[model samples]
Target: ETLVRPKPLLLKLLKSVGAQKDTYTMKEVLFYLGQYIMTKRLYDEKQQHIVYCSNDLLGDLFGVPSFSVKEHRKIYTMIYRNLVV
Candidate 1:
């Protein structure tokens, strides 16, 4: 059984990214999230490693307007804390 489950916001994000899984592991969530970010072209033009939260969903998820790719794990940890176990 899956140990991690998406909360409402995460569920919405997964669906928007075309993820059909009812539940996901942290790695899986990060994968689909990367896909969504890529599809949305949210990465900063000048600093490719920085992601810009240009949409409400991402903005709310990270609780910030922007973040560096290096902070992915940190933010992901924060996100995971809100998931249903």
Candidate 2:
């Protein structure tokens, strides 16, 4: 079940199954979602504008900070080849 996608109501079912076995499974799905912005090269002026805009929205939603387009664009591109497209 953990290996599957779209696990809605998974918590209730998992609790009933006791499949966790009294063990701990720490999750930071939100963190991963946040990281997806940075790692996905989503700040590009083309395709990534969506990601950049999303990062802005996510920043607002999560009360985090937004990335600077001018500064980060140049600084990040030199090291990473994955552009928006």
Candidate 3:
């Protein structure tokens, strides 16, 4: 539903050495990801399941509760991609 940068490019940008360094002021439980609007619905329970899974992984990885680009590709590839299609 939006721009699809190549996966390798995405991976490279994500994996770059300084990528995880704190640079943005944004921080919160719910945040807006800038984008175009589209409407699609999927079952609620699986989304909830992934939230929990990601939460657990988050706790393990950072000793806190959060998810963002650091967690993006991992969670998407692990949960959303496999489950959705």
Candidate 4:
């Protein structure tokens, strides 16, 4: 889901699956939501005002569950690309 038109998929995934108030899945949601921000390039270090917030939100993701290994790699790939800049 990170090749052709990857951003839209991220957007849909965020809007459809995000904004939940489940404390149990908060971590998963954070990591999942972070994929959207990473794909959208919303957290460049230059954008310091939001950089902290983005990183902080990412921290909310913390450790990814083993079941989502494949999914996590996809999002993590986006995160890595953004950071390698």
Candidate 5:
């Protein structure tokens, strides 16, 4: 089983998005995170690629005010940091 376990903070995010899994593949976590972003309409209207951390929970998780899609590698790193190695 190569699935990665989520840290407490990441687990909170996952559960907020209705993901009940204790472990998830990297892609699965990304998928749910994307879903949460879309559900919250976090994308900027002027620039769709730009995402805003309007939610406190998201703000804490990302540790950034906002980020562009081009910085997706950074997003992956953030998510990876919240997983059990």
Candidate 6:
């Protein structure tokens, strides 16, 4: 399902100092990550869950009020290498 660059490279690019500068327009950013952007939000009250998200505004990413998951190595890099925390 992944192509262009390996997840690790994308992760590195995401955390690089250059990535933070945002010289690229939002459209360019979305061009690469637009698939992650959603088209709707679906709330399933029967199961007490939300199962969909509709874009960057954080709309129930995993049937939870607040949730995010990362498989990238940069979580450690950001915390350990950058010492951001």
**Each model's C-alpha lDDT?**
0.80, 0.36, 0.28, 0.41, 0.84, 0.32
Give the Å error, residue 57, model 2.
Answer: 18
* Model 6 residue 9 distance off true place after TM-score fit, in angstroms: 20
Compared with the true structure, model 6 gives a TM-score of: 0.20
What is the C-alpha lDDT profile of model 2 across 1-60, one tens digit per residue? 122221323223233333443222223222333354565455556554444444443343
- Model 5: colliding residue pairs: none
Best candidate, lDDT:
5
Q: Which ten residues in a row have the lowest lDDT in candidate 4?
A: 60-69
RMSD of each: 1.9, 13.8, 13.8, 12.7, 1.7, 12.2
> What tens digits encode model 6's per-residue C-alpha lDDT throughout 1-85?
2122213433344334234432344343334333332222233345323333343233322222432324234222322332111
lDDT of 4 by residue, 1-85 (tens): 2222223333345555454432223344456565655665445555422433233333333232211324556555654433211
Query: Residue 61 of model 5: what lDDT?
Result: 78
Q: Give every collision pair in model 4.
A: none
Which pairs, if any, clash in model 3? Answer: none
**Backbone steric clashes in candidate 4, count:** 0
Name the 10 consecutive residues with the lowest summed lDDT in model 2: 76-85
RMSD of 5: 1.7
Better of 1 and 2 by TM-score: 1
Top candidate when judged by TM-score against the true structure = 5
Ranking by lDDT: 5, 1, 4, 2, 6, 3
Once fitted onto the true fold, the runs of candidate 6 whose alpha carbons sit more than 4 angstroms away are: 1-21, 38-51, 54-57, 60-85
Model 3 weakest 10-residue run by lDDT? 34-43
Q: Which stretches of candidate 3 lie over 4 Å from their true place?
A: 1-21, 28-50, 54-56, 61-85
Residue ranges of candidate 4 with Cα displaced over 4 Å: 1-11, 15-24, 48-85
TM-score: model 3 vs. ground truth: 0.19
Q: Rank by TM-score, descending?
A: 5, 1, 4, 2, 6, 3
The alpha-carbon deviation from the true structure for residue 61 of candidate 5, after best TM-score superposition, in angstroms, is 1.3
